Design a protein around this nucleic acid. Structure first.
Ligand SMILES: [Zn+2]
Ligand SMILES: [Zn+2]
Ligand SMILES: [Zn+2]
Lengths: 52, 224, 325, 136, 141
RNA sequence: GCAGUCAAGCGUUCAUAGCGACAUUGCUUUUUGAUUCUUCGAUGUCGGCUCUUCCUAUCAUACCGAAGCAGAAUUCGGUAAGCGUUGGAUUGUUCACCCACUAAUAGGGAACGUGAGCUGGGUUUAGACCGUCGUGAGACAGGUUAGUUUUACCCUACUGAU
RNA sequence: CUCUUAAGGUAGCCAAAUGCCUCGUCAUCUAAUUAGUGACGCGCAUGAAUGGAUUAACGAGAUUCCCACUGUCCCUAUCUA
């Protein structure tokens, strides 16, 4: 029992993100470039593997 | 009823416990489900006793008692004897045997009217057992496995032995005790039967790994 | 049922590449035969055969021109050395043939008990002749006769004296006699006297279906060195040869078999016999001092086959004590 | 160290180290046990690991039953000679170092134990108590 | 007189035994940790193969020493008392070499069992790099 | 030896979860080389043993992120070198290959750490044997055996003491 | 039949103090052995008074293993001049 009205709430904070292919960071979906200075603030991102 | 439990995570409950129709014994091992193997299956019928004799926890393989009396070994002490006295009824007698062996629960196998004893026991214990229990004793063998308090469990109405016991020996013991028996295992093929479990007139306890084709034959042989 | 394949149709021609392809096909066919036989009995009765196509191709060239052969068979147990599928094979072409099989290595059995094997054949219409291998070395009206008794040839299980009986003709050892049976190979041909001519056989074996598991097959067939078992074939050394003869030759006292119950019994099996021997011979392990009995098996067995200890087999069936020393 | 070891022990003085040849008290046909390694038994340069009473060892047989030797096996030491201490203060020791063959989970292979058994081992391996005639 | 402890019906003897032959064949096993398919390499030009680390065996196809190199191919078969690992016939063209294997296992408590299990060794052709390196010449000794 | 960029594709559909040729930009001095600048009025030269410290390109341990992560078990990556990283048969061995325990049995450097600290099994003298070559003396970086390992009481350094 | 101006490794024997590839292959010994023993030999390059092979006895010769033994070691400690 999750009643997915709240699964949406949780996925907003766990499975709604984007990942830098070079830094492996947790970033927001709309973000173009990374957050950290470690990675030169690159743009190589991807969605987070939420499905299969 | 065959109530399956685990002492801490081992299955040999006949090692860490003991059972008869006047007292029940348990080591200090936590895991309250184990204690619920008798706290739940009884009312206030007989008392349970939490004990550690001789600073040990193997009370079943060290004490070999009866409905009307108990044998406690020599290595023990008065501090663990006095609780075993006070928290038990005076209809049963407690006596420190002053003999050579210590593991009474692997040399003696006894119910309320008949017994089976190791062949090389002292002839003073040979008489002390009947002086304190009035039980008849038959010290020959089980199958060559001279240890009897581990390869044999005994109620008054049913007992059990190990697979390698001969077709001659099962019938010999049936004739001796006038009680049936089967060459049954316990806890998924472990032939240490008198230690892998324990039984009484109505109650049976085995390990949580134990299987249903052994529970079903236990329910037949031991009950009636 | 079958132990040798067929060999037809040379037909006086050409095409080297094809008239041996037909023999490759005659092996694909004879090979198919052993697989079906092994599958046919239970699932495991490992026979001493050969898969190398070339050693059988070799034997497919030492008969057709040889044209009259003689069979050397050890007299320790001809029951498993007698060849079965030769009378049905070397007859059909209507040319110079007819093995007329023999038995040899025939001076380790005594006089009267040799009639035990002379009588095994007079009932069943089999030909033979007793003539030795090592001892000559340069129907009842016959007892035993020496070497006095166009190509010719000879065939052996392995180790019959195909290099030690070449002295049957001249005796100068133009082929080397060895301890192992695996040396004979790459067929050899001997020639003398301008009309008679030999064709020596390379190394062979011949499979079997009887006496495969609990046997004594390791009597003349296999090397003694590279044997990982050392117990099984020695288990039938511990059966015959009573204890109070081995006790008297090597001069040791092993035990008196206190395991007189049904685990061991009497006439000790090969676990209690070799333990008080390597302790008396001094061979110990590398890491601890204990009886290295498998290295004592290789020694006592090597004396069982070479001629220090002896045993022959009575011919046709179960008898208790036919042979006596 | 809990590969069948039920309880948890205090320190018992390490009598027999590797290279030791201790008797076999059980009726498995064997006669001795050549210790090769010990469970737990952390490391130190040039310290060879040892076994205490009630501990498990990996071991090998040298004398008896060719069916058994030439392969390693778990074993459980039940008697030693190096005098150790019980927390009651009194020191004890046996006359011979002796052990038992077992499976990895601490279960037994034999039908008995020819001799006495330590209290530190009986309470620790329960299947030893299911075959012990004498506990000290 | 005992009961199987798994299915209940089959009474087994007091010779020292465990649950039924049915359940000991079906559920219980002593032959896991081995792949039934063993890949090996081979060179057609020099007709001889190798173990992945090791000198080329030099033995011929369908030779006795194939048993030895196949046993050296690392499986758990070197643990459990092998016996009688001879070969079964395969079509030579089919590039498969099958061995029949027999381990003798230890059950729960000191009861020994036979076994009949099989394994296939699959051969793949090689470019023969070391023999080819001998053919090439980058330096002289 | 180590690492990175392209991404032609592998990856049940799924370039990049992991992988990744065709090419290419680099890093290192723990490999083998190349060169001959120093030392030929000698810097005591292999390995092992003992012992201290440091490095990170982290095997384990701590908090974490990332997956074709349901759990368990695993793979990739990051902060990070604070604390650990073994006993043994064989070999003179560096190297290695196994057995076993283990949280793990990571890689490396300090005149290829350390011989007025040791050992001398080895190479590398003289004795001597075998094989091949050489007419021959003799040669072999081919194999085998035997073969002296020196001194600190001075300055510094360090441990300790006035 | 022969080719090389003569002959063409016979008996025997071995990875042996002779074998580069070599930690040769197999078996055995060990928990595990590049060592060791036996066997196999197209033997780079064994071999017959440049003596071959086998040998009881002997050896401050070289090598492997084992029973016993022990501070060689685990792991150091102590006593005396
Ligand atoms: Zn980033
Ligand atoms: Zn069943
Ligand atoms: Zn090749």
């Amino acid at each position: 029992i999750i009643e997915p009205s709240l699964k949406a709430l949780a996925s907003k904070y766990n499975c709604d993100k984007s990942v830098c292919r070079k830094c492996y960071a947790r970033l927001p979906p709309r973000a173009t470039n990374c957050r950290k200075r470690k990675c030169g603030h690159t743009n190589q991102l991807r969605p987070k593997k939420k499905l299969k | 009823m065959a109530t399956r439990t685990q002492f801490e995570n081992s299955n040999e409950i006949g090692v860490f416990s003991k059972l008869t129709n006047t007292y029940c014994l348990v080591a200090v091992g936590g895991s309250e489900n184990f204690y619920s193997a008798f706290e739940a299956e009884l009312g206030d019928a007989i008392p349970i006793v939490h004990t550690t004799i001789a600073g040990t926890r193997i009370i079943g393989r060290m004490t070999a008692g009866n409905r009307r009396g108990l044998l406690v070994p020599t290595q023990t002490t008065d501090q663990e004897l006095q609780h075993l006295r006070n928290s038990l009824p005076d209809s049963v007698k407690i006596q420190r045997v002053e003999e050579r062996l210590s593991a009474l629960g692997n040399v003696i196998c006894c119910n309320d009217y008949v017994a089976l004893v190791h062949p090389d026991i002292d002839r003073e214990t040979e008489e002390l057992i009947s002086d304190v229990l009035g039980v008849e004793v038959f010290r020959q063998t089980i199958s060559g496995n001279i240890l009897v308090g581990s390869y044999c469990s005994l109620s008054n109405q049913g007992g059990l032995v190990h697979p390698q016991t001969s077709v001659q020996d099962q019938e010999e013991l049936s004739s001796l005790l006038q009680v049936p028996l089967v060459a049954g295992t316990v806890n998924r093929g472990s032939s240490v039967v008198g230690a892998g479990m324990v039984v009484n007139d109505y109650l049976a306890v085995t390990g949580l790994d134990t299987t249903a084709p052994e529970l079903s034959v236990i329910e037949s042989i031991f009950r009636l | 049922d079958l132990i040798v394949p067929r060999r037809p149709e040379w037909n006086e021609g050409m095409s080297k590449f094809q008239l041996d392809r037909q023999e490759k096909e005659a092996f694909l066919e004879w090979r198919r035969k052993l697989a079906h036989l092994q599958e046919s009995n239970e699932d495991l009765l490992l026979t001493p055969f050969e898969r190398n196509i070339e050693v059988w191709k070799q034997l497919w060239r030492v008969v057709e021109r040889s044209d009259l052969v003689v069979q050397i068979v050890d007299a320790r147990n001809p029951l498993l050395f007698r060849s079965v599928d030769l009378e049905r094979y070397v007859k059909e072409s209507d040319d110079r043939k007819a093995n007329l099989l023999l038995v040899n290595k025939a001076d380790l059995l005594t006089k009267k008990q040799r009639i035990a094997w002379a009588k095994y054949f007079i009932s069943k219409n089999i030909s033979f002749t007793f003539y030795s291998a090592l001892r000559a070395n340069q129907v009842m009206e016959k007892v035993k006769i020496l070497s006095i008794d166009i190509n010719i040839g000879l065939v052996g299980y392995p180790n019959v004296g195909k290099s030690s009986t070449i002295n049957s003709l001249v005796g100068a050892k133009k082929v080397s006699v060895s301890s192992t049976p695996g040396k004979t190979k790459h067929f050899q041909t001997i020639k003398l006297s301008d009309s008679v001519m030999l064709c020596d056989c390379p190394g062979l074996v011949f499979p079997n279906f009887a006496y495969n598991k609990g046997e004594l097959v390791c009597n003349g067939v296999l090397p003694i060195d590279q044997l990982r078992d050392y117990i099984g074939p020695a288990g039938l050394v511990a059966e015959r040869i009573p204890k109070y003869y081995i006790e008297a030759i090597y001069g040791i006292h092993i035990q008196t078999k206190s395991r007189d119950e049904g685990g061991n019994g009497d006439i000790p099996t090969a676990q209690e016999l070799l333990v008080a021997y390597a302790r008396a011979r001094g061979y110990m392990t590398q890491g601890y001092g204990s009886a290295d009995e498998p290295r004592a098996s290789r020694y006592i067995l090597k004396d069982y086959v070479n001629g220090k200890l002896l045993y022959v087999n009575p011919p046709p069936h179960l008898e208790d004590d036919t042979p006596y020393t | 160290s809990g590969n069948g070891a039920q309880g948890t022990k205090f320190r018992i003085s390490l009598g027999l180290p590797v290279g030791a040849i201790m008797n076999c008290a059980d009726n498995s046909g064997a006669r001795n046990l050549y210790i090769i390694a010990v469970k737990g038994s952390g490391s130190r340069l040039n310290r060879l690991p040892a076994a205490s009473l009630g501990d498990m060892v990996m071991a090998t047989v040298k004398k008896g039953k060719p069916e058994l030797r030439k392969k390693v096996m778990p074993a459980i030491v039940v008697r030693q000679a190096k005098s150790w201490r019980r927390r009651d203060g009194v020191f004890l020791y046996f006359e011979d170092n002796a052990g038992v063959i077992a499976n990895p989970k601490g279960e037994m292979k034999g039908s008995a134990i020819t001799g006495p058994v330590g209290k530190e081992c009986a309470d620790l391996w329960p299947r030893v108590a299911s075959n012990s005639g004498v506990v000290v | 007189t005992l009961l199987c402890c798994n299915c209940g019906t089959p009474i087994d003897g007091s010779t020292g035994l465990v649950m039924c032959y049915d359940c000991i064949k079906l559920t219980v096993d002593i032959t896991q940790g081995i792949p039934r398919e063993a890949n090996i390499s081979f060179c057609r030009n020099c007709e001889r193969f190798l173990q992945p680390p090791g000198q080329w065996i030099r033995a011929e196809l369908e030779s006795r020493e194939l048993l030895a190199i196949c046993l050296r191919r690392l499986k758990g078969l070197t643990k459990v008392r092998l016996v009688d690992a001879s070969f079964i016939w395969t079509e030579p063209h089919s590039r498969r070499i099958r061995i029949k294997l027999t381990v003798q296992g230890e059950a729960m408590t000191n009861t020994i069992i036979q076994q009949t299990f099989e394994v296939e060794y699959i051969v793949i052709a090689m470019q023969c790099p070391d023999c080819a390196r001998s053919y090439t010449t980058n330096t002289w000794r």
